[PDB]
Write a protein that binds this ligand. Structure first.
Ligand code: CDL
Ligand code: PC1
Ligand code: PC1
Ligand code: 3PE
Ligand code: 3PE
Ligand code: SF4
Ligand code: SF4
Ligand code: SF4
Lengths: 360, 178, 318, 97, 56, 156, 115, 68, 80
């Protein structure tokens, strides 16, 4: 009942999203990113949007960036709830799941009030953001955030000082820093081994330089350290939501350049220029210049990356998507050495694993 | 800035009191009675569940669900076969085939939506220049046949004539944002 | 009239199993911030009957790789032992007055293991065999401690008869003399019956329903109700041994009522424990139940041998 | 004390649906008794009650009919029978029935 | 909100901390569902003068 | 009174049993499974209806295809559907499984689970709200309620 | 015969129940449903092959400790003897010997599993 | 709410109470206003076999007294 | 060694309890005065008939009847 070799045969959520993206426009291709990592939706489309903005040499405005980082941290709390509670289900503890999926339902209500979809909101666009958030929503995010600390404290009371959780996560999945770097890990799988690295700090992409928070780092590369790191990332995302609420400046939410981002619905019904631009944007696209980029963000799993290749056309020529989870699964066999089937189950749960990005 | 989560500041201070406290943590499962008490607290709370068919989940006007083809207040058909709802549809769900109507009007002879290809993205309704096709509130249109979920002009117009009393209100609420 | 007695002992135990399933689901629900079944009956008091009927209408699975004899015979044995264990139980006057009741219980349970352990082999598959070997490890872990705990506890009762514990506890409980033995007995009853956190044989996230992955219908139902019957049995044993209720020779139904109360409390405690904690590992269970429970168990057995003597408290042989 | 007051509230719940017939007609049919304010009755039979002292999934609810279009929905109930005028208020897109 | 003041005590003791103030549910402290209409603002490049697309 | 009436009421009973206790499978492939979890979650609790998961397909009465079905994962789906013991039902959940969905025209996608398993009920969405999946499950209950098997057996 | 009767009753309950479970329902058998599970895919080999057990030493010492139980279990009758010193010393010796053996196994890493 | 669990608990308790009171009353009914005799040693069995052979009817539970 | 036991009461307190209870079980029988009444009580129990004895004419200390003064007065078992 102990493992001598692991050969993950992924390929069962391989659809061909990259080829379909080559066949679609830059706006048509956006929901694929919502659908790749399907518990951290807005972060994937944030990455895509940043890449296309870089190719366009265009920046979004302050308000759009602020609500973008706000919903990025909301996605972090989503996926960390997901990862922690699924890891616990695997290990046997099932009550955090039901305690926290109510909070996830509230978060989905935020998504459905902002967009009209609980999960696959195509809200982060290349040119800023689609739709301005409604009256009376920051109050609700505040009312949620003031109590989520109590919720996460309940979970932490259940299964941090426990003996079964400790005995079942500690000295499990131990990774050296050199092994992590060479195998290609990112995010929490680095910070658990003790590598001070976070792109929100080193390569800030929307407003993260303008907002303060701390990066949890672990001293042992066991599962317990990179469980507490996720818990503290949830707390720090809450700390950042506080700031993003306290400053959310007024102004346009999308780039005021109607050759990239579509105009107002009434502006396209009194002006001919903006109607032409509506037409071409919503039928042809906006013709990003040639070139290429690699842009990466801290997805809640790690370094979600997109290598776009372009041309004068309104479509992309290549879009590879780096999946944090690809390299983690590659390192699965290394991390499970002298361990058992149950400990391997825990190691699967620890990587924050999801296969829409891996297979894609 | 960073911070350690599981790094002891320093060790090597123990007396018989701390030993007693640790040995009573052990041998009494004291950190497990806390979990028992937590689950006991949750037994005496109001559960978050709802009697679904009789009381339901909260939605917003922006919610995007079943589709519909709308009309003007005069009853005139509002689509004009500008054929860009299918240009942008990233699933290739929409087809149009259009002709003059014998009144001398740009109108459709076809408006199909394979709702088994639709991803419910809203691009069609934010691309239509006349607010003709919308994505309404109905999420309770499950079927026992694949062929029922392949719609045409008549089904979409039935939806519109059904859900206009809701869609008009949702649009009235959500415009000034779109 | 003995057959009517069999009825009054057997059918209510089966209804108790059936409604324990409901109570489990609803308690776990409310701990999980939800309402369990409240639809099929008024408050869901028909879901067990629905489950049973639906299970007995499903087509049973006779695989090709299987050994059909052991396959069909293991659930039979499981329920038969789960239902024969209730026989000597004094509540307060038993159905069958044995002089070595605790040995009957011990042997019956050590044989109840073989249901799991032959169903898993007969069901020729991998996760099935994993569940079987995990059952072997579990029994290796718990049987020694169960026996020596029970010895130390009855070493102040004077006999293996279950009915003598009622007079041993006429003015007190055996929980205050032996709360440590009671702790370890509780957790060994938790390791027995394959109940969480010591489940480790239908460990749905480690194994895909071990020793039942190939069982579908009424056979699986038999395993189910055997488990949920042994739960109530072990709670009844804990409350007959340690939580001794009041006999009152004129009022024996009082004994029966307090027995009911304490058994329900301890069963709800099992469900509570399922809801609260994660699962052990079947090697960590060995390490626990050999390197923590067996030392203290032997030490306290020495103590309980000394104690009748240096206190002049040697009990009577009837 | 307060135990007696919650028992009184339960007595009111038991005794605010007509009688035994009217109580069972709601209890076997919706698995709830909670009394609220009648917002309005529909042109098919639906009732659309309300009680804002509850939380934000139960402050509004429906009690369906027993015959909508010759279908006998006394037992076979479905959410497709809420027309759009009340769909909007029931799914909480409005505070305006 | 309705916990009869002794079950409130039980749950606040077993938990470890006051949770009647920080509840999992929502009663009246939420942004209500029908709202006033907005007037969304208008970004720069609406200058009406000294704004040519070749410059920005 | 009549044998046919007795048969009708017996069938009502067996349908009530199979309807009030249908045990789905832990079989979710893609995003739609997250909304299945949310249905399992407190707000739209499934166990309220007698709908609790079981991991083995032999202790299961229904399978919910909550995700995209690929050419590499179709044999496994069919093995699982086969291993399920009859009476058994299927719920296709999401556009990716009703039809091919957003991945209809791709090389590694089957354009509907209709081609591999027989579907009883189709739930649309990308994703379908767990509210909607719950509606579809109750619609499957209603479908079981009108099976009329022993009736037709008597009429053979 | 009372006990024989109770056990026969339980036996016949179980067998009647299995008879019902098998001959009441409907059957649609075919080779693709009657073959072992292995999670959707097919097995790569048989399950009637060696499963290396890594706690065999623990199993054997469990057997010896079972015998120790069998020796300790006469104590409730051994206590009503007149001596009450020989039995004390001998039970002390037995338990202490068992504990010594457990300690030797523990220190020699017999309770650890064969990785 | 949590008081919606008390029905199932009540059925469970009413079902667990019956095996005891039922056994007690069946014993008293067959043996007759008397607890069912325990015979743990051969002496008690001797007493019961005796009382059987005293009765005139093969029943150990008639309790002939000082009318002889 | 006091420091060693101080360390072991924190780390591994299960074996400390075990050795303590073992030594206590061995030492406490040596201490008590009630330890000797156990054999005497086990002896007092008459599981078998006290067979009478023939009057040789030289049995003064042996009683002629159950409730005579002679023989072992079991009043030490009373009010123990
Ligand atoms: C064990 C004690 C017995 C249970 C009890 O009476 O405690 C109720 C009471 C409930 O307190 P609560 O949690 O705040 O109630 C929530 C709201 O009152 C809930 O407010 P509401 O709007 O939902 O209205 C509640 C209304 C609902 O009306 C009803 O009574 C429901 C219908 C009754 C059958 C269920 O009244 C009741 O709930 C009365 C319940 C009394 C217990 C009924 C016992 C029958 C169970 C069936 C046995 C067979 O508990 C206590 O005050 C004592 C607690 C002692 C624990 C220590
Ligand atoms: C085996 C012995 C019988 C077991 C008990 C059977 C209980 C039947 C029952 O309660 O059905 C209630 C049901 C209650 O209605 P229902 O639950 O099926 O309809 C759905 C109701 N909602 C939506 C509210 C959940 O009665 C029936 O519908 C008819 C079926 C039972 C007919 C039995 C004939 C004998
Ligand atoms: C207290 C709760 C515990 C209850 C546990 C015991 C369960 C008691 C079940 C009582 C209900 C009995 C009816 C079960 C019928 C299941 C078989 C079935 O419905 O298939 C249709 C069967 C078969 O009908 P058929 O001949 O038309 O089958 C057609 C075959 N194919 C599919 C190939 C076309 O109908 C019957 O046989 C009904 C009579 C059986 C009654 C026996 C009792
Ligand atoms: C007069 C002088 C003589 C007196 C002599 C008496 C001296 C005092 C004796 C006290 C001894 C009490 C018994 C303690 C046994 C447990 C031993 C122990 O150390 O805990 C075992 C286990 C270890 O946990 P761990 O943190 O890993 O430490 C081990 C490091 N080697 O930890 C565990 O077991 C936890 C895993 C099991 C979890 C199961 C869930 C438990 C839930 C609690 C329910 C409690 C209800 C009990 C009610 C019983 C009623 C019958
Ligand atoms: C699919 C097939 C499945 C078969 C499963 C079989 C289940 C068997 C159940 C486990 C039995 C193991 C324990 C052995 C029986 C109990 C022994 C016992 O101690 O009591 C027997 C009893 C007399 O024993 P005792 O109480 O000591 O003396 C009383 C004096 N007045 O009275 C007796 O002496 C008679 C005891 C007869 C035991 C009958 C066993 C039935 C076997 C049928 C098969
Ligand atoms: S975009 Fe609107 S008007 Fe144009 S074809 Fe589509 S529905 Fe008709
Ligand atoms: S919502 Fe999106 S996928 Fe669906 S029909 Fe409209 S454009 Fe196509
Ligand atoms: S239909 Fe949409 S939500 Fe469902 S699996 Fe496909 S992409 Fe994901």
């Amino acid at each position: 009942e102990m493992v001598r070799k692991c050969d993950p045969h992924i390929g069962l959520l391989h659809r061909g999203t990259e080829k379909l993206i080559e066949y679609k426009t830059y706006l048509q291709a956006l929901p694929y990113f919502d659908r790749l990592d399907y518990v951290s939706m807005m972060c994937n489309e944030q990455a895509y949007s940043i890449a296309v903005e870089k190719l366009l040499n265009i920046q979004p405005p302050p308000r759009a960036q602020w609500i973008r980082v706000l919903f990025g941290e909301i996605t972090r709390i989503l996926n960390h709830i997901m990862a922690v509670t699924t890891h616990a289900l695997d290990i046997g503890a099932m009550t955090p799941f039901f305690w926290m999926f109510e909070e996830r339902e509230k978060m989905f209500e935020f998504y459905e009030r902002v967009s009209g979809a609980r999960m696959h909101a195509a809200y982060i666009r290349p040119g800023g953001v689609h739709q301005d958030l409604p009256l009376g929503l920051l109050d609700d995010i505040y009312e949620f955030s003031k109590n989520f600390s109590l919720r996460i404290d309940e979970v932490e009371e259940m299964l941090t000082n426990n003996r079964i959780w400790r005995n079942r996560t500690v000295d499990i999945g131990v990774v050296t820093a050199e092994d992590a770097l060479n195998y290609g890990f990112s995010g929490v799988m680095l910070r658990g081994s003790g590598i001070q690295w976070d792109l929100r700090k080193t390569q800030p992409y929307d407003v993260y330089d303008q907002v303060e928070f701390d990066v949890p780092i672990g001293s042992r590369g066991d599962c317990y350290d990179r469980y507490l790191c996720r818990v503290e990332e949830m707390r720090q995302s809450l700390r950042i939501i506080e700031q993003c609420l306290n400053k959310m400046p007024p102004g346009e939410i999308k780039v005021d350049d109607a050759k990239v981002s579509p105009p107002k619905r009434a502006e396209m019904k009194t002006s001919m220029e903006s109607l032409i631009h509506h037409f071409k944007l919503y039928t042809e696209g906006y013709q990003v210049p040639p070139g290429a980029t690699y842009t990466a963000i801290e997805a809640p799993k790690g370094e979600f990356g997109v290598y776009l290749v372009s041309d004068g056309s309104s479509r992309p020529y290549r879009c590879k998507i780096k999946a944090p989870g690809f390299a983690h699964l590659a390192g699965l066999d290394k991390m499970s050495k002298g361990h058992m089937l149950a400990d391997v189950v825990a190691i699967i749960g620890t990587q924050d694993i999801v296969f829409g990005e891996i297979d894609r | 800035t960073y911070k350690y989560v599981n790094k002891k500041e320093q060790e090597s201070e123990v007396d018989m009191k701390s030993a007693t406290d640790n040995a009573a943590r052990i041998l009494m499962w004291t950190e497990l009675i806390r979990g028992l008490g937590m689950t006991l607290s949750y037994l005496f709370r109001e559960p978050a569940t709802i009697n679904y068919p009789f009381e339901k989940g909260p939605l917003s006007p922006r919610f995007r669900g079943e589709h519909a083809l709308r009309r003007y207040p005069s009853g005139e058909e509002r689509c004009i076969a500008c054929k860009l709802c299918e240009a942008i549809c990233p699933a290739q769900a929409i087809t149009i085939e259009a002709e003059p109507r014998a009144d001398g009007s740009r109108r459709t002879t076809r408006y199909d939506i394979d709702m088994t290809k639709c991803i419910y993205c809203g691009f069609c309704q934010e691309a239509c220049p006349v607010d003709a096709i919308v994505e309404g509130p109905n999420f309770e249109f499950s079927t026992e046949t694949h062929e029922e979920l392949l719609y045409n002009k008549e089904k979409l117009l039935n939806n519109g004539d059904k859900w206009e009393a809701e869609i008009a209100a949702n649009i009235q609420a959500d415009y000034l944002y779109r | 009239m003995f057959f009517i007695n069999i009825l009054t002992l057997l059918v209510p135990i089966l209804i108790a199993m059936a409604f324990l399933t409901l109570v489990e689901r609803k308690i776990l629900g409310y701990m999980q911030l939800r309402k369990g079944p409240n639809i099929v009956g008024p408050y869901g008091i028909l879901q067990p009957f629905a489950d049973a009927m639906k299970l007995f209408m499903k087509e049973p699975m006779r695989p090709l790789t299987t050994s059909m004899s052991l396959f069909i015979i293991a659930p039979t044995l499981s329920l038969t032992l789960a239902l024969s264990l209730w026989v000597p139980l004094p509540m307060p006057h038993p159905l069958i007055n044995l002089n070595l009741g605790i040995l009957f219980i011990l042997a019956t349970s050590s044989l109840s293991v073989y249901s799991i352990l032959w169903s898993g082999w007969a069901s020729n598959s991998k996760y099935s065999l994993f569940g079987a070997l995990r059952a072997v490890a579990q029994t290796i872990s718990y049987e020694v401690t169960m026996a020596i705990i029970l010895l130390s506890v009855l070493l102040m009762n004077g006999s293996y008869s279950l009915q003598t514990l009622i007079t041993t506890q006429e003015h007190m409980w055996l929980l205050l003399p032996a709360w440590p033995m009671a702790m370890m007995w509780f957790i060994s009853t938790l390791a027995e019956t394959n109940r969480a956190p010591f489940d480790l044989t239908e460990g749905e996230s480690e194994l895909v329903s071990g020793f039942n992955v190939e069982y579908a219908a009424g056979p699986f139902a038999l395993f189910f109700m055997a488990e949920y019957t042994n739960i109530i049995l072990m709670n009844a044993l804990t409350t007959i041994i340690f939580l001794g209720p009041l006999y009152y020779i004129n009022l024996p139904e009082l004994y029966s009522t307090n027995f009911m109360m304490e058994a329900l409390l301890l069963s709800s405690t099992f469900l509570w424990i399922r809801a609260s904690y994660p699962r052990f590992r079947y090697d960590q269970l060995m390490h626990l139940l050999w390197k923590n429970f067996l030392p203290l168990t032997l030490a306290l057995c020495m103590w309980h041998i000394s104690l009748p003597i240096f206190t002049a408290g040697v009990p009577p042989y009837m | 004390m307060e135990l007696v007051e919650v028992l009184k509230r339960g007595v009111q719940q038991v005794t605010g649906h007509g009688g035994l017939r009217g109580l069972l007609r709601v209890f076997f049919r919706a698995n709830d008794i909670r009394i609220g304010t009648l917002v309005g009755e529909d042109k098919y039979g639906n009732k659309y009650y309300e009680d804002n002292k509850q939380f934000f999934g139960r402050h509004r609810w429906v009690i369906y009919t027993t015959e909508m279009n010759g279908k006998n929905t006394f037992w076979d109930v479905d959410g497709s029978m809420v027309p759009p005028e009340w769909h909007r208020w029931l799914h909480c897109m409005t505070d305006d029935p | 909100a309705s916990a009869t003041r002794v079950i409130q005590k039980l749950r606040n003791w077993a938990s470890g901390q006051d949770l009647q103030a920080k509840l999992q549910l929502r009663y009246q402290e939420i942004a209500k569902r029908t709202q006033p209409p907005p007037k969304l603002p208008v970004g720069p490049s609406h200058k009406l003068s000294n704004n040519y697309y070749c410059t920005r | 009174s009549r044998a046919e009436y007795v048969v009708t009421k017996l069938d009502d009973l067996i349908n009530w049993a199979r309807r009030s206790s249908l045990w789905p499978m832990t079989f979710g492939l893609a995003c739609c499974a997250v909304e299945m979890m949310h249905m399992a979650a407190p707000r739209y609790d499934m166990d309220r209806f007698g709908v609790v998961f079981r991991a083995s397909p032999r202790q299961a009465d229904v399978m919910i295809v909550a995700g995209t079905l690929t050419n590499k994962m179709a044999p496994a789906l069919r093995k699982v559907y086969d291993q399920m013991p009859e009476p058994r039902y299927v719920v296709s959940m999401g556009s990716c499984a009703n039809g091919g969905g957003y991945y209809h025209y791709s090389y590694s996608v089957v354009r509907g689970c209709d081609r591999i398993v027989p579907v009883d009920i189709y739930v649309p969405g990308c994703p379908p709200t767990a509210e909607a999946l719950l509606y579809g499950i109750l619609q499957l209950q209603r479908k079981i309620k009108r099976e009329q098997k022993l009736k037709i057996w008597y009429r053979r | 015969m009372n006990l024989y009767t109770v056990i026969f009753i339980n036996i016949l309950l179980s067998l009647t129940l299995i008879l019902v479970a098998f001959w009441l329902p409907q059957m649609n058998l075919y080779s693709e449903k009657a073959n072992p599970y292995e999670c959707g895919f097919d097995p790569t080999s048989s399950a009637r092959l060696p499963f290396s057990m890594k706690f065999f030493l623990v199993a054997i010492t469990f057997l010896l400790f079972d015998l120790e139980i069998a020796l300790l279990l006469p104590l409730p009758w051994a206590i009503q003897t007149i001596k009450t010193s020989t039995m004390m010393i001998m039970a002390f010796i037995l338990v202490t010997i068992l504990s010594l053996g457990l300690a030797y196994e523990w220190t020699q890493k017999g309770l650890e599993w064969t990785e | 709410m949590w008081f919606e669990i008390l029905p199932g608990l009540a059925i469970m308790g009413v079902c667990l109470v019956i095996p005891g009171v039922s056994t007690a009353y069946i014993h008293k009914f067959t043996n007759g206003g008397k607890e069912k005799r325990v015979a743990r040693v051969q002496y008690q069995w001797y007493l019961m076999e005796r009382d059987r052979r005293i009765s005139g009817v093969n029943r150990y539970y008639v309790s002939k007294g000082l009318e002889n | 060694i006091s420091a060693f036991l101080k360390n072991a009461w924190a780390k591994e307190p299960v074996l400390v309890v075990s050795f303590s209870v073992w030594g206590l079980a061995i030492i406490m029988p040596m201490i008590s005065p009630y330890t000797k009444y156990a054999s005497m009580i086990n002896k007092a129990t008459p599981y078998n008939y006290p067979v009478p004895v023939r009057d040789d004419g030289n049995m003064p200390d042996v009683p002629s009847h159950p409730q005579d003064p002679l023989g072992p007065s079991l009043d030490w078992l009373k009010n123990l």
